[PDB]
Nucleic acid binder design. Structure first.
Ligand SMILES: [Mg+2]
Ligand SMILES: [Zn+2]
Ligand SMILES: [Zn+2]
Lengths: 50, 99, 309, 49, 76, 1154
DNA sequence: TCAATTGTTATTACATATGGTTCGTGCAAACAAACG
DNA sequence: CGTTTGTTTGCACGAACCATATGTAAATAACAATTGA
């Protein structure tokens, strides 16, 4: 929208082409991560953690 | 579980279920009867028009609260508009008189 | 007694006619041929028609009795073979299209076959008509059996993939992986993923959710194309703050900045357009707007504006 | 496969195991239900049964 | 502070008018167009309006009279 | 904005006017790029853009280009919300009969054409031809042929012959007919025919025709030739996670309809044989009905799964339809829910709200305060601070909710007190703390119950909560005048323990200087809490107005009673705290405090009572131990004697003297006697056996057994439970109803053997199932009662009527079941009440009989009083405040605007779970008894006539009046009177239960209302419930809302027309200005379900019961619904005309009448 | 004009034509840098 | 404030590469309605 393009021009920031969809802990829940499992599709390339 | 505002149902512009979609409580028919038994007309109206369904109403109510002006513009609940379009989707011509 | 089932009424109205007798279809085709022959004699016996035919021939190289005898012997043939359509229409009963719809599509195919059937070949009508009826029924299934229609070539690809996956299921023992089909089939193995990803039949919005409660699937789907109240309040506050910030600028600088973007007006104007309006050079306006932005960047004048980020 | 999977996964008589206890597990395993395909319904069961 | 509204009801009466008039006065307060007629004890505008009603300083008659006077002096 | 809602048939031109385009293809989405594929069910050109101000093709993506239509794709650029408002249409190639108007039963199409529905269905499905003005030579218009007859007449008749098939024939018949001539001919037939069945049929037909012609509706519009299409956003096709798509069944139904329509167009183009085209038309029809109703056609067509597709009609009707699931009740923002704890420290007007819940509910207020106080520059900054829960956010939250009420509501809202307001106090927890005194009102216990919290937003809502719902303002039940905040169990036990007296207690006999001295003495341990002592106590009396005369004396009391006296407010007598203070005593004390001192003293007194009772119950240390359940020493002997009697009687039965049934009954009787003896012995051993001495031999005092103290004080339990604990638990009856001959002799202190436990379960499971399946029908009854009486408000201050009903104490069997005091309390006298000696006017005519007047009447022993009742009120559209009474929830007369109908419905319905109940349901439904009591229709001399198989005809002859009325009385009905007698109107001829309709018709309105109220009150009294009669009278008045015009005369009504009684009353009032009136009526009486379903407002009627019938009738009749009702205004989201919105509605009417 | 039954309502597959989509390029317009 | 030089983007224009469309095979209760005695 206008009066936001102006802000981006003023402060010289760039609108990211990727939006954050990260998995966040549900509100209120507070615990310790005891196990992580990664399932990768056959064709995909495994990441460092996998 | 508590909810100020959040996602709204698709066909009927109303809040969603309980604590999984972060939705609001169901102000059932019997609660409406309880309000009617009291003299609470404005409470009832805001309960079923601004807090629940009026698409234009709830944004204006939120803005008004933000600047400390506790007043509402009730408007028409969206569910009634859906009902009108649905009866009119039959061969029935239902309209609002003295527009 | 009485019934409301439309298929039952169709079976009643159609079973009245006797099926057929051999050499009956040849006679009916003969009658059709005589009717079209009458029409051809009528068209030939019109001198204007022959003159028009000659004119069209040059361009390219550069009447009720006959029709009645045509319509008749076409009602008979189709009405006689209506049982054939049902037999080969019940094969596709549960492919997402109702039985009577398949019957009607096969009926249309049967009329097409009767129109294009040739008796001089000395060939049974059933063999020729089966091709057309199957074609019509299966094309109808492909065309109007899915809420999100998919084309005929893609339906053929999906059917081929399903047939080959079924065969490999038994020839292998557990399942074929998409890569494994790249061998049995001859596709780049990226298309196979797309075909498998082709959306299946959409779920009915009234599907009762688990635990047999009175809640349906539609009660868990939210309107994504909505503006959150907080975002709308932020937009209004930003508009007000921008109005205030532009108010504290020189009249011409504020005006040019307001025009360069869609600020409380119609579409944004280009430097050429504002120069047309301000009757000044384009580069002058570019410099003016750059200086205005520089001024807005001055701290103690845009702190709130950066807070808006 | 479709028939067997439909029965085992999505049917009234196959439910998530109540697993918050040994007693809950065992008492769920040996549960007698009059509902399901071929039985009564909670809406119109009647008091006599 | 405010627990029960029985004296204000005794003043205005009928238990629906008491709500409407209190809402009118409290709204006049909330928008910066008026000020309390009683010593504010860190109460919300609604409770202040109810206390005004209790003291008899505000009625449906008084509010309209004040509005009319303000309108008449608005001419200047 | 809009004054009313008009519903009428939709003409094809109207449907085309609604549409913004013609849906021509079944395509929805392009399956690769999910943009809508045009011009299909989801089309951008027809139904609007998919993204806000973004043209589909991509040539226009700016708000500037708004209002223009593209060219590469023809898509207008506007908001996306327009998708919910634009409609399309489908041009059906063959007319199709609207299912509703064809299968309404009565079928409007069939009734209009005077054609049986069977024949019309035959015609529609192309099973038989129907002539259409096909010559007046051999075949009549309505005459129906078949294939054989049609073929035969084809050659015999080429011209002047018109017989068609399917919906086109029905449309031709409907369009050809002229309504005026048919109406006139039917009027002639009705006036020239003598038969009740044919008269009724003609009446129905003429009513349909007159309604059709007066309105703008045309019969041919009943056959759909253009089909409107719902806007796409109301039948979404959204994508789910993982590439799956969710669609509404309406999409499938529309796709089927469009497919079949296009196929029919193709077939007609190809000139297919008649059989194929007829089958296609049948299919298209069936698709249309499936879309409209997906019923009324034998088999509902299912979707991909094996479940029927949800139709267009299915989404409006039923418990899950729009009306009840999204219009009358909705999900609500600013609402939460959590478990409830006790939190006994609270004051009556506040509740404990968890901090996190308060923070979440009050987020916008917190943002506003943060911005206003400058701690956050922008709203996003305030949101960040709130999410971080910075220290100052808690102070801001504390400021926000300082005096902001919240509404606490429990799941089943059985009556008004199910929702109450409280002033929150922040709690560091996660469970709502609820004041103990409101649990009874909420019917809430603390075993896991959950309560929802609602935040009133506007100033009006906050003031409504503060002045109408606040727990302090609701302390008297709205059903009866009794208090509803009585301390329940622990408070009662504490007060009873601290009030009762021992015989030889520490510090007995000493004299004290006052309550403070007593408290010091007890708390320092020098005196027992209950030791009989003399204490100087100062009472205050309010004989005259205002003045509180102080009276001081030496009272003989206990230390505990003196201590409790400090709590009591000023103007109360000391005699109240000089008893044992059981549960009943505390309730009476609170009621006296309210009726003498007011509301605020009562609230403070209740809070102080709760605190003191809790504290002294704690100090008591009242515990339950196994030894507390003492078994009688005579139980073994009693059971041995009972077994000996049983053996004796079994031997006698074996000797052939008494049949098995009589022996069984006698064994039951002796076992019941033995059980009664055991219970009596247990109570004797457990109630007063505690024996102790006072400086002497011995004395006897009421026992201090913990179980006994719990039972006697009224805290918990009852004599039944106590006997079930120590004594034998009587006889168990198997669920069939038979009493088991062997009773459970063992109590619960001693074990129950296996057989006894099995027998106990026999009944326990029956009780559990009964209570589970009892609330459903009680809730249904409450719903019906609310719907019949929802539109009833106190609109006037005084109707001025002099009519009333004579209230007298109810006596059955020579004993009073309810004294006149409770029946005439709070009601306005209708006529001046005289002394029995006629000495003088005891009370003026229109005085509200409050407690003082009732005491005066009791002292003068006035047996009967005539008071105003809501059923005899002369107001129109409501009732005057003076006829209703006292507004039991408050003490003062009912205010103008109170929705008394809903209050009455809830009061009658909320005790339904204590119920039997089907008796009340039958009474309110006005069901006729199976074998009613034949009453004397007219006064005169009775006589007999023919007595053959056509059963006896009874003739009653007036002295001078004509006697054409003869009653066909069955012979097997025993006559109460003889043949040669004389009887009065409304008297009893046969014997049996009386049908309410006959009561109203013969005795009068007062008779029927008295009968109904007496019966239902007898049921409730039998169950121990207490309901004031105002509510039952309100329900009866709503039941008597209709009247039939016996003689229209000079008015504008017909004869058989059943007009609303108010309309005819107003018509007679106005015609009185002229000379001619000729308007007389007979008051009808309908069941609540029937009366509610026949109302002026078609929206309210269509909301709760069958929607299809109501909507079809309204459409054909062209009804115009002026809202003027609670249900209607609630539906359209406008201020209800009942409470604070009553003034607004009055002003709106003021502006409207100009 | 009764009385029993019926219905409604509530808790393949292969070939061909064209057509749209993706991709690379060019030109002018529209910015962006650095001086005078 | 203009001038010279240099850089990126928006339309428009082929090319071709795959996508589409089309054709062708010989329970319980209650209450009205309707039909039948
Ligand atoms: Mg509980
Ligand atoms: Zn476009
Ligand atoms: Zn009255």
């Amino acid at each position: 929208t206008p009066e936001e393009k102006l802000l981006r021009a003023i402060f010289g920031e760039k609108a990211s082409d990727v939006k954050d969809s990260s998995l966040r802990v549900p509100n209120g829940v507070s615990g310790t991560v005891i196990d992580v499992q990664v399932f990768t599709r056959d064709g995909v390339e495994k990441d460092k953690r996998a | 579980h508590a909810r100020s505002t959040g996602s709204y149902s698709l066909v009927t512009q109303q809040p969603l279920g309980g604590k999984a979609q972060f939705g609001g409580q169901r102000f059932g028919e019997m609660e409406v009867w309880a309000l009617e038994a009291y003299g609470a007309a404005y409470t009832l109206q805001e309960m079923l028009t601004v807090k629940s369904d009026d698409v234009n109403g709830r944004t204006k109510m939120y803005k008004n609260i933000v600047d400390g002006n506790h007043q509402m513009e009730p408007g028409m609940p969206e569910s009634f508009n859906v009902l009108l379009k649905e009866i009119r989707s039959l061969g029935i011509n239902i309209e609002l008189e003295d527009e | 007694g009485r019934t409301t089932d439309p298929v039952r009424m169709y079976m009643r109205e159609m079973g009245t006619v006797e099926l057929l007798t051999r050499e009956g279809e040849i006679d009916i085709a003969k009658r059709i041929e005589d009717g079209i022959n009458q029409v051809q004699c009528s068209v030939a016996e019109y001198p204007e028609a022959i003159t028009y035919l000659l004119e069209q021939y040059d361009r390219v190289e550069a009447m009720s009795i006959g029709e009645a005898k045509a319509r008749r012997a076409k009602k008979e043939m189709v009405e006689a073979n209506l049982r054939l359509v049902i037999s080969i229409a019940k094969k596709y009963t549960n492919r997402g299209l109702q039985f009577l719809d398949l019957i009607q599509e096969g009926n249309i195919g049967l009329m097409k076959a009767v129109d294009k059937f040739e008796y001089r070949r000395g060939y049974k009508f059933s063999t020729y008509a089966t091709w057309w009826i199957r074609q019509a029924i299966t094309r109808s299934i492909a065309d109007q059996a899915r809420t999100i229609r998919i084309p005929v070539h893609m339906i053929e690809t999906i059917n081929k993939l399903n047939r080959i996956s079924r065969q490999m299921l038994q020839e292998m023992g557990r399942e074929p992986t998409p890569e494994e089909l790249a061998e049995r089939m001859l596709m780049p193995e990226d298309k196979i993923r797309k075909v498998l990803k082709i959306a299946k039949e959409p779920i009915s919005m009234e599907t009762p959710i688990g635990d047999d409660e009175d809640s349906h699937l539609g009660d868990f789907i939210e309107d994504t194309t909505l503006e959150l109240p907080l975002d709308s309040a932020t937009t209004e506050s930003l508009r007000a703050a921008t109005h205030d910030v532009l108010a504290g600028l020189t009249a011409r600088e504020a005006k040019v900045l307001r025009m360069r973007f869609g600020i409380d007006m119609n579409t944004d104007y280009t430097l050429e357009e504002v120069g047309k309006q301000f009757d000044v050079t384009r580069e002058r306006i570019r410099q003016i707007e750059a200086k205005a932005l520089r001024k807005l960047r001055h701290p103690s004048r845009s702190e709130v504006l950066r807070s808006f980020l | 496969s479709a028939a067997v999977k439909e029965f085992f996964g999505s049917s009234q008589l196959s439910q998530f195991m109540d697993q918050n206890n040994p007693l809950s597990e065992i008492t769920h395993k040996r549960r007698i239900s009059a509902l399901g395909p071929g039985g009564l319904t909670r809406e119109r069961a009647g008091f006599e049964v | 502070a405010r627990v029960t509204v029985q004296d204000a009801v005794e003043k205005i009466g009928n238990r629906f008018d008491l709500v409407l008039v209190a809402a009118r006065r409290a709204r006049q307060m909330q928008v910066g167009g008026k000020d309390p007629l009683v010593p504010e004890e860190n109460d919300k505008t609604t409770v202040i309006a109810l206390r005004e009603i209790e003291e008899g300083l505000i009625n449906n008659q008084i509010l309209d009279v004040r509005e009319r006077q303000e309108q008449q002096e608005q001419e200047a | 904005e809009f004054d009313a809602i008009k519903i009428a048939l939709a003409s094809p031109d109207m449907i085309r006017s609604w549409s913004f385009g013609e849906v021509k293809k079944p395509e929805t989405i392009n399956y690769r790029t999910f943009k809508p594929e045009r011009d299909g069910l989801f089309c951008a050109r027809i139904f609007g853009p998919v993204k806000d101000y973004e043209c589909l093709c991509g040539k226009y993506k700016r708000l500037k280009h708004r209002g223009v239509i593209c060219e590469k794709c023809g898509v207008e650029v506007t908001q996306t919300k327009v998708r919910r408002e634009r409609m399309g249409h489908i041009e059906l190639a063959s007319p199709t009969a609207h299912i509703w108007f064809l299968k309404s039963l009565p079928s409007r199409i069939g009734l209009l054409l005077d054609m049986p529905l069977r024949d019309i269905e035959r015609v529609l499905y192309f099973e038989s031809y129907v002539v259409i003005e096909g010559g007046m030579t051999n075949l009549e218009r309505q005459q129906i042929l078949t294939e054989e007859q049609y073929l035969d007449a084809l050659e015999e008749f080429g011209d002047e012959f018109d017989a068609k098939m399917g919906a086109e024939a029905i449309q031709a018949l409907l369009k050809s007919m002229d309504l005026e001539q048919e109406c006139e001919q039917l009027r002639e037939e009705l006036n020239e025919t003598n038969s009740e069945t044919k008269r009724k049929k003609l009446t129905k037909r003429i009513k349909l025709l007159e309604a059709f012609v007066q309105s703008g509706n045309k019969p041919e519009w009943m056959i759909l030739t253009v089909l409107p299409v719902l806007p796409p956003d109301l039948r979404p096709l959204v994508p789910l996670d993982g590439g799956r798509f969710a669609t509404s069944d309406l999409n499938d139904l529309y796709r089927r309809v469009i497919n079949r329509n296009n196929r029919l167009k193709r077939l007609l183009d190809l000139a297919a044989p008649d059989i194929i085209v007829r089958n296609e038309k049948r299919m298209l029809q069936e698709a249309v009905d499936a879309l409209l109703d997906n019923g009324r056609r034998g088999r509902a067509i299912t979707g991909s799964n094996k479940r029927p597709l949800k139709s267009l009609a299915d989404m409006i009707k039923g418990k899950q339809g729009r009306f009840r699931q999204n219009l009358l009740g909705k999900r609500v923002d600013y609402s939460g829910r959590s478990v409830i704890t006790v939190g006994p420290y609270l004051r009556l007007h506040q509740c404990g709200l968890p901090k996190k819940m308060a923070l979440e509910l009050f987020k916008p207020f917190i943002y506003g305060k943060l911005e206003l106080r400058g701690l956050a520059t922008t709203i996003k900054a305030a949101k960040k601070m709130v999410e971080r829960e910075e220290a100052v956010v808690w102070d801001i939250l504390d400021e926000v909710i300082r005096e902001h009420p919240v509404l606490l509501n429990r799941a089943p809202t059985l009556h008004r007190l199910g929702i109450q307001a409280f002033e929150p106090v922040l709690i560091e927890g996660k469970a709502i703390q609820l004041h103990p005194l409101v649990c009874a009102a909420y019917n809430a216990d603390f075993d896991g119950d959950q309560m929802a919290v609602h935040v009133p937003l506007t100033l009006e809502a906050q003031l409504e909560a503060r002045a109408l719902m606040m727990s302090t303002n609701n302390i008297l039940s709205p059903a009866n005048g009794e208090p509803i905040i009585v301390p329940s169990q622990d408070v009662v036990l504490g007060l009873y323990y601290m009030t009762r007296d021992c015989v030889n207690a520490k510090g007995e006999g000493m004299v004290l200087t006052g309550p403070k001295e007593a408290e010091r003495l007890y708390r320092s341990g020098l005196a027992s809490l209950h030791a009989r002592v003399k204490v100087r106590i100062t009472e205050y009396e309010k004989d005259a107005n205002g003045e509180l005369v102080a009276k001081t004396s030496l009272k003989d009391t206990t230390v505990g009673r003196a201590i409790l006296w400090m709590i009591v407010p000023k103007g109360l007598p000391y005699s109240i705290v000089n008893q044992a203070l059981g549960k009943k005593a505390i309730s009476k004390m609170l009621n006296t405090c309210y009726r003498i001192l007011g509301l605020k003293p009562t609230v403070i007194f209740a809070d102080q009572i709760m605190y003191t009772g809790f504290a002294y119950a704690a100090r008591s240390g009242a515990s339950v131990g196994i030894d507390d359940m003492v078994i009688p020493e005579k139980k073994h002997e009693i059971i041995s004697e009972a077994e000996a009697e049983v053996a004796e009687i079994q031997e006698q039965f074996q000797s052939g003297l008494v049949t098995a049934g009589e022996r069984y009954n006698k064994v039951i009787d002796i076992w019941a006697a033995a059980n009664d003896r055991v219970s009596k012995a247990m109570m004797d051993n457990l109630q007063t056996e505690t024996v102790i001495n006072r400086d002497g031999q011995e004395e006897k005092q009421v026992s201090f057994n913990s179980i006994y103290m719990m039972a006697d004080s009224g805290a918990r339990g009852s004599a039944a439970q106590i006997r079930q604990l120590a004594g034998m638990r009587g006889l168990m009856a198997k669920p069939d109803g038979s009493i088991i001959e062997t009773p459970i002799t063992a109590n619960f202190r001693e074990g129950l053997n296996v057989l006894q436990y099995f027998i106990s379960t026999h009944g326990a499971r029956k009780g559990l199932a009964d209570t589970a399946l009892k609330t459903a029908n009680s809730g249904y009854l409450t719903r019906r009662l609310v719907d019949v009486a929802q539109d009833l408000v106190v609109t006037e201050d005084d109707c001025g009527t002099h009519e009333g009903i004579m209230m007298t104490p109810v006596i059955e069997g020579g004993d009073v079941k309810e004294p006149l005091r409770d029946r005439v309390l709070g009601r306005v006298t209708a006529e001046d009440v005289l002394k029995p000696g006629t000495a003088d006017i005891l009370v003026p005519r229109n005085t509200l009989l409050h407690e003082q007047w009732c005491d005066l009447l009791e002292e003068n022993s006035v047996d009967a009083v005539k008071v105003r009742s809501v059923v005899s009120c002369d107001t129109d559209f409501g009732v005057c405040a003076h006829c209703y009474g006292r507004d039991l929830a408050r003490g003062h007369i009912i205010n103008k605007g109170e929705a008394i109908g809903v209050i009455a419905a809830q009061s009658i319905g909320e005790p339904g779970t204590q119920l039997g109940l089907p008796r009340v349901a039958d009474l309110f439904e006005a069901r006729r008894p199976k074998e009613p009591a034949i009453l004397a229709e007219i006064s005169g001399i009775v006589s007999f006539g023919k007595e053959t198989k056509g059963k006896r005809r009874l003739v009653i002859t007036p002295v001078d009046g004509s006697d054409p009325y003869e009653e066909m009385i069955p012979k097997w009905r025993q006559l109460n009177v003889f043949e040669g007698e004389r009887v009065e109107r409304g008297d009893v001829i046969s014997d049996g239960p009386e049908a309410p309709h006959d009561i109203l018709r013969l005795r009068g309105v007062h008779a029927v209302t008295r009968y109904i109220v007496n019966e239902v009150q007898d049921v409730y009294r039998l169950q121990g419930v207490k309901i004031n009669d105002k509510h039952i009278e309100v329900i009866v008045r709503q039941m008597l809302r209709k009247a039939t015009i016996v003689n229209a005369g000079s008015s504008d009504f017909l004869e058989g027309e059943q007009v609303e009684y108010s309309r005819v009353k107003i018509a007679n009032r106005e015609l009185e200005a002229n000379g001619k009136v000729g308007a007389t009526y007979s008051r009808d009486l309908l069941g609540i379900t029937k009366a509610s379903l026949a109302t002026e407002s078609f929206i309210s009627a269509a909301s709760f019961q069958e929607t299809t019938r109501v909507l079809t009738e309204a459409a054909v009749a062209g009804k115009r619904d002026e809202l003027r009702g609670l249900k209607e205004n609630v539906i359209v989201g406008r201020l209800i005309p009942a409470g604070t919105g009553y003034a607004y509605h009055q002003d709106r009417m003021r502006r409207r009448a100009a």
